[PDB]
Amino acid sequence: HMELALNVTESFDAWENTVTEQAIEDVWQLFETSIKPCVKLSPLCIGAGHCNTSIIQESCFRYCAPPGYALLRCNDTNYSGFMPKCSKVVVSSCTRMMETQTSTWFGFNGTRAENRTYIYWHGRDNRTIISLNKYYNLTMKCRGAGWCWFGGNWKDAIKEMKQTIVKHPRYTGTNNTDKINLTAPRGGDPEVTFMWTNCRGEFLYCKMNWFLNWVEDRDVTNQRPKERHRRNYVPCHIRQIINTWHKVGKNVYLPPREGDLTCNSTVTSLIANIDWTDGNQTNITMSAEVAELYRLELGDYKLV
Numbered sequence: 001h002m003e004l005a006l007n008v009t010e011s012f013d014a015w016e017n018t019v020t021e022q023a024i025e026d027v028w029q030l031f032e033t034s035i036k037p038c039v040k041l042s043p044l045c046i047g048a049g050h051c052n053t054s055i056i057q058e059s060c061f062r063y064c065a066p067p068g069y070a071l072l073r074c075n076d077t078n079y080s081g082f083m084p085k086c087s088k089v090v091v092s093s094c095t096r097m098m099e100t101q102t103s104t105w106f107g108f109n110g111t112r113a114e115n116r117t118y119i120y121w122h123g124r125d126n127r128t129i130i131s132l133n134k135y136y137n138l139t140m141k142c143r144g145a146g147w148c149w150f151g152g153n154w155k156d157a158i159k160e161m162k163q164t165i166v167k168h169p170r171y172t173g174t175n176n177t178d179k180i181n182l183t184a185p186r187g188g189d190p191e192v193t194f195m196w197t198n199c200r201g202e203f204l205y206c207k208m209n210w211f212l213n214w215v216e217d218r219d220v221t222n223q224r225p226k227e228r229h230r231r232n233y234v235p236c237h238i239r240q241i242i243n244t245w246h247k248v249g250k251n252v253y254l255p256p257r258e259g260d261l262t263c264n265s266t267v268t269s270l271i272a273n274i275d276w277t278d279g280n281q282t283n284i285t286m287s288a289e290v291a292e293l294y295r296l297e298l299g300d301y302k303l304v
C-alpha cells in the first residue's frame, strides 16, 4: 500500500529536469481537481520506476480537499536535511493549501521564532537550498487589486541575515573579501524580482523591486556615498493565468473569494537557493514553493 525508498539523484538539467519538475508539473495537475463531470481515473507517482494512477468513485456537504494525494515524514529531531540513517515514520494526507496563505519569500507563521536567527539548511554542497529564521519584527499584508504592506526592521533584519550568513564559510583557503548580489533564472537574462502571495484562494503576483535593490560588501561606508528618500509597497498584479518565474511560461486556477478581501500574512521563514559554485559566485535566489509549505513543519516533505 505504501512502498517507497530514500534515493534522490542530483545532477545538472532544468527544463526536462527531475523530480523537482515532476513535483510541481503534477502538483498543479492535482490542483485542477476538486469536482466536475461524471467519471473515474488519473495518476500518482515518485517511488520505484513505475507509476500509479489513482482511480476515484462517486455518483452523478463537507469534503476535505485533495481527491487522493498525501504526505508523510521520518522523525528524531528539528531538521538537518540529508545523509539520514532513517527509522520511524507517520500518517498524514489532507491538503487544503489554496484555501490558506503563502509567499515565495518568507514562510508564514514562525513557530518558536527564536531571537537566534536560524539558517536551517538542506545541504547539497555547492548547489543547494536554505531557510533563515529570525525573531525580529517583519509583517506582511496585501490589499485588494494588488499592492502589499509591511512593518518591521527589514533593513536590519536583513543585516541579521547578513550577520547570520557570514560565520559559516570559515576561511575557505585565502585572504579575501565578498560581494553579494542576486539573480534567479537559468539560460536567459530578465532583470526583475517576483514574489507571489496566497491568502484566500487567489494566486496574486508581485513586481517586488525596491525591496530587492540591495548590493552587499564586507566592510563598507555610506557618508560620502549616495542618499535618496525611497519607500515601499508592492506593485502586484494578479496573474490567475500564471506567467512563470523560473521560465517564462504559464498556469491558472479555480478559487472562491470574499469580495472585499484584504490579504494578511504572518512572517518569518525567509528563504534562498544560494549558488556559490567555484569561482566568483555567491548567488542568492528565491524559488521555493508548495513542497516547502509542509517542508516547513516536518523537516522535509515526502509525498507519493
Ligand SMILES: *[C@@H]1O[C@H](CO)[C@@H](O[C@@H]2O[C@H](CO)[C@@H](O[C@@H]3O[C@H](CO[C@H]4O[C@H](CO)[C@@H](O)[C@H](O)[C@@H]4O)[C@@H](O)[C@H](O[C@@H]4O[C@H](CO)[C@@H](O)[C@H](O)[C@@H]4O[C@H]4O[C@H](CO)[C@@H](O)[C@H](O)[C@@H]4O[C@@H]4O[C@H](CO)[C@@H](O)[C@H](O)[C@@H]4O)[C@@H]3O)[C@H](O)[C@H]2NC(C)=O)[C@H](O)[C@H]1NC(C)=O
Residues within 6 Å of the ligand: 139, 140, 141, 149, 150, 151, 152, 153, 264, 265
Ligand atoms: C494582520 O496581521 C498584522 C500583524 O502584523 C496586522 O498588522 C499590524 O498591526 C499593528 C497594530 O495595528 C501594526 O502597527 C501599525 O503599523 C504601522 C507600520 O508602519 C511602520 O513600518 C513600516 C515599515 O518600516 C514603515 O512604512 C513605517 O515607517 C512605520 O515605521 C506603524 O506605523 C504603527 O505603529 C504605531 O504608530 C503610532 C503613531 O505614532 C503610535 O501611536 C504607536 O505607538 C506606534 O509607533 C510609535 O510608537 C513607538 C513606541 O511605542 C515610538 O517610538 C514611535 O516613534 C511611534 O510614535 C511614538 O509613540 C510612542 C508612545 O507610544 C513614543 O515613543 C513617542 O511619543 C512617539 O511619538 C501602527 O500602529 C503593525 O505594524 C501591523 N503590521 C503592518 C503590516 O504594518 C493587521 O492589522 C492584521 N489584519 C487585520 C485583521 O487587521
Ligand SMILES: *[C@@H]1O[C@H](CO)[C@@H](O[C@@H]2O[C@H](CO)[C@@H](O[C@@H]3O[C@H](CO[C@H]4O[C@H](CO)[C@@H](O)[C@H](O)[C@@H]4O)[C@@H](O)[C@H](O[C@H]4O[C@H](CO)[C@@H](O)[C@H](O)[C@@H]4O[C@H]4O[C@H](CO)[C@@H](O)[C@H](O)[C@@H]4O)[C@@H]3O)[C@H](O)[C@H]2NC(C)=O)[C@H](O)[C@H]1NC(C)=O
Residues within 6 Å of the ligand: 279, 280
Ligand atoms: C572576483 O572578481 C572580483 C572583481 O573583479 C575580484 O576583486 C578584485 O580583487 C583585486 C585583488 O588584487 C583588487 O585589486 C586591489 O585593488 C585595491 C584598491 O581597490 C579597492 O579599494 C577602493 C577604495 O576602497 C575601492 O573603490 C575599490 O572598489 C576596491 O575595493 C588596490 O589598492 C590593491 O593594490 C594593493 O595590492 C597590490 C597587490 O595586488 C599591490 O601591488 C599594491 O601596491 C597595493 O598594496 C600595496 O600598498 C602599500 C601602500 O599602501 C604598499 O606598502 C605595499 O607594498 C602593498 O603592496 C589591489 O590591486 C581589485 O580592485 C578587485 N576588482 C575590482 C573590479 O575592483 C576578486 O578578486 C575575484 N575573486 C576571485 C576569487 O577571483
Ligand SMILES: *[C@@H]1O[C@H](CO[C@H]2O[C@@H](C)[C@@H](O)[C@@H](O)[C@@H]2O)[C@@H](O[C@@H]2O[C@H](CO)[C@@H](O[C@@H]3O[C@H](CO[C@@H]4O[C@H](CO)[C@@H](O)[C@H](O[C@H]5O[C@H](CO)[C@@H](O)[C@H](O)[C@@H]5O)[C@@H]4O)[C@@H](O)[C@H](O)[C@@H]3O)[C@H](O)[C@H]2NC(C)=O)[C@H](O)[C@H]1NC(C)=O
Residues within 6 Å of the ligand: 179, 180, 181, 215, 216
Ligand atoms: C554587485 O553589485 C555591485 C554594484 O551593482 C550595481 O550595478 C549593477 C549590476 C546594478 O545591479 C545596479 O543596480 C547596482 O547598483 C557591482 O559592483 C560594480 O558593478 C558595476 C555594474 O555592473 C560595474 O561598473 C562598471 O563601470 C564601468 C565604468 O567604466 C569607465 O571606464 C573608463 C575607461 O577606462 C574610465 O575612464 C571610467 O572612469 C574612471 O576614471 C576615474 C578617474 O580616474 C576613476 O575615478 C573611476 O573609478 C574610473 O576608473 C570608468 O571606469 C563600466 O564601463 C562597466 O561596464 C561596469 O558597469 C563594476 O565593475 C562593479 N565594481 C566592482 C565593485 O567590482 C558588483 O560587480 C556586483 N557583483 C556581482 C557578482 O554581480
Ligand SMILES: *[C@@H]1O[C@H](CO[C@H]2O[C@@H](C)[C@@H](O)[C@@H](O)[C@@H]2O)[C@@H](O[C@@H]2O[C@H](CO)[C@@H](O[C@@H]3O[C@H](CO[C@H]4O[C@H](CO)[C@@H](O)[C@H](O)[C@@H]4O)[C@@H](O)[C@H](O[C@H]4O[C@H](CO)[C@@H](O)[C@H](O)[C@@H]4O)[C@@H]3O)[C@H](O)[C@H]2NC(C)=O)[C@H](O)[C@H]1NC(C)=O
Residues within 6 Å of the ligand: 073, 074, 075, 076, 077, 078, 090, 298
Ligand atoms: C518526531 O520526533 C521529533 C523529535 O524526535 C524524536 O526523537 C526520538 C527519540 C523519538 O522517539 C521521539 O520521542 C522524539 O519526538 C518530534 O519533535 C518533537 O515532538 C514532540 C511531540 O510531537 C513535541 O512536543 C510537543 O510540543 C510542545 C513542546 O514541549 C516539549 O518540551 C517539553 C520539555 O521537554 C515537554 O514538556 C514536552 O513533552 C515536549 O517534549 C508541548 O507543549 C506539547 O505538549 C502538548 O501536547 C500534548 C498532547 O496533545 C498535550 O496533552 C499537552 O497538554 C501539551 O499541550 C507536545 O508534546 C516537541 O516539541 C517536538 N520538537 C520539535 C522538533 O519541535 C516530532 O514531533 C515527531 N513527530 C513528527 C510530527 O514527525
Ligand SMILES: *[C@H]1O[C@H](CO[C@H]2O[C@@H](C)[C@@H](O)[C@@H](O)[C@@H]2O)[C@@H](O[C@@H]2O[C@H](CO)[C@@H](O[C@@H]3O[C@H](CO)[C@@H](O)[C@H](O[C@@H]4O[C@H](CO)[C@@H](O)[C@H](O)[C@@H]4O)[C@@H]3O)[C@H](O)[C@H]2NC(C)=O)[C@H](O)[C@H]1NC(C)=O
Residues within 6 Å of the ligand: 077, 078, 079, 114
Ligand atoms: C534542534 O533544536 C532543539 C530546540 O531546542 C532549542 O530550544 C531553544 C529554546 C534554545 O534553548 C536552543 O538552544 C535549543 O537548542 C534542540 O533541543 C534541545 O536540545 C538539548 C541538547 O541538545 C536537549 O537536551 C538533551 O536531553 C537528553 C535527554 O534524553 C539528553 O540525553 C541529551 O544529552 C545528549 O545530547 C546529545 C546531543 O545534544 C546526544 O547526541 C546524546 O545522545 C544525548 O542524548 C541532552 O542533554 C533537549 O531535550 C532539547 N530541548 C528543547 C528545548 O528542545 C536540539 O538539540 C537541536 N538539535 C540538535 C541535533 O542539536
Ligand SMILES: *[C@@H]1O[C@H](CO)[C@@H](O[C@@H]2O[C@H](CO)[C@@H](O[C@@H]3O[C@H](CO[C@H]4O[C@H](CO)[C@@H](O)[C@H](O)[C@@H]4O)[C@@H](O)[C@H](O)[C@@H]3O)[C@H](O)[C@H]2NC(C)=O)[C@H](O)[C@H]1NC(C)=O
Residues within 6 Å of the ligand: 181, 182, 183, 184, 185, 186, 275, 280, 281, 283, 284
Ligand atoms: C547569479 O548571479 C550572477 C550575476 O548576477 C549570474 O552570473 C552571470 O551570468 C551571466 C550570463 O551567463 C554572465 O554574463 C556573461 O559575462 C561574460 C563575461 O565577459 C567579461 O569578461 C571578459 C574577460 O574578463 C571581458 O573581456 C569583458 O569585458 C567582460 O567583462 C560576457 O562575455 C557575456 O556577454 C555575458 O554578459 C556572467 O559572466 C555571470 N557572472 C559571473 C559569475 O561572472 C548567475 O547566472 C546567477 N545565478 C543564478 C543561479 O541565477
Ligand SMILES: *[C@@H]1O[C@H](CO[C@H]2O[C@@H](C)[C@@H](O)[C@@H](O)[C@@H]2O)[C@@H](O[C@@H]2O[C@H](CO)[C@@H](O[C@@H]3O[C@H](CO)[C@@H](O)[C@H](O)[C@@H]3O)[C@H](O)[C@H]2NC(C)=O)[C@H](O)[C@H]1NC(C)=O
Residues within 6 Å of the ligand: 136, 137, 138, 151, 152, 153
Ligand atoms: C515586534 O514585536 C514585539 C512584540 O510585542 C507585540 O506583541 C503582540 C502580541 C501585540 O499585542 C503588540 O501590540 C506588541 O507590541 C513588539 O516589541 C515589544 O513591544 C512591547 C510593547 O508593545 C514592549 O514592552 C515595553 O517596553 C518598553 C521599554 O522596555 C517599556 O516602556 C514598557 O513598559 C514595556 O515593557 C517591548 O519592549 C517590545 N520589545 C520586544 C521584546 O520586541 C513590537 O511592537 C513589534 N515591532 C513592530 C511594530 O514591528
Ligand SMILES: *[C@@H]1O[C@H](CO[C@H]2O[C@@H](C)[C@@H](O)[C@@H](O)[C@@H]2O)[C@@H](O[C@@H]2O[C@H](CO)[C@@H](O[C@H]3O[C@H](CO)[C@@H](O)[C@H](O)[C@@H]3O)[C@H](O)[C@H]2NC(C)=O)[C@H](O)[C@H]1NC(C)=O
Residues within 6 Å of the ligand: 125, 126, 276, 277, 278
Ligand atoms: C563544490 O563542490 C566541488 C566538487 O564537488 C565534489 O563533491 C563531492 C561530494 C563529489 O561529488 C566529487 O566527485 C565532486 O568533485 C568542490 O571541488 C573540490 O574542492 C575542494 C576544496 O577546494 C578540493 O579539495 C582540496 O584538495 C585538492 C586536492 O585533492 C586541492 O587541489 C584543493 O586545493 C582543495 O584544497 C577538491 O580538489 C575539489 N574536488 C575534488 C573532489 O577533487 C568545490 O570546492 C566545492 N565548492 C564550494 C564553493 O562549495
Ligand SMILES: *[C@H]1O[C@H](CO[C@H]2O[C@@H](C)[C@@H](O)[C@@H](O)[C@@H]2O)[C@@H](O[C@@H]2O[C@H](CO)[C@@H](O)[C@H](O)[C@H]2NC(C)=O)[C@H](O)[C@H]1NC(C)=O
Residues within 6 Å of the ligand: 115, 116, 117, 135
Ligand atoms: C537574543 O540572544 C542574542 C544572543 O546572540 C548570541 O548568540 C548567537 C545567536 C550568536 O550569533 C552570537 O554571536 C551572539 O552573541 C542577543 O544578541 C546579543 O547582543 C548583545 C549586545 O549587547 C551581546 O551581549 C551579544 O553579542 C549577544 N548575545 C548575548 C550573549 O545575549 C539578542 O540581542 C537577544 N535578543 C532577544 C530579543 O532575545
Ligand SMILES: *[C@H]1O[C@H](CO)[C@@H](O[C@@H]2O[C@H](CO)[C@@H](O)[C@H](O)[C@H]2NC(C)=O)[C@H](O)[C@H]1NC(C)=O
Residues within 6 Å of the ligand: 175
Ligand atoms: C594573504 O593576506 C593575508 C592577510 O592577513 C596575509 O596574512 C598576514 O601574513 C603575514 C605574514 O605573511 C602575518 O605577519 C600577518 O599576521 C597576516 N596579516 C596580518 C597583518 O594580521 C598573508 O601573508 C597573505 N599571503 C601571502 C603573502 O602569501
Ligand SMILES: *[C@@H]1O[C@H](CO)[C@@H](O)[C@H](O)[C@H]1NC(C)=O
Residues within 6 Å of the ligand: 005, 006, 007, 048
Ligand atoms: C536507490 O534505491 C534503490 C531501490 O530503488 C536501492 O536498491 C539502492 O541502494 C539506491 N541506490 C543508491 C545507493 O543510491
Ligand SMILES: *[C@@H]1O[C@H](CO)[C@@H](O)[C@H](O)[C@H]1NC(C)=O
Residues within 6 Å of the ligand: 044, 052, 053, 054, 055, 056
Ligand atoms: C495505486 O493507487 C490507487 C489509488 O486509487 C490504488 O487503487 C491502487 O491500489 C494503487 N496501485 C498500486 C498497486 O500501486
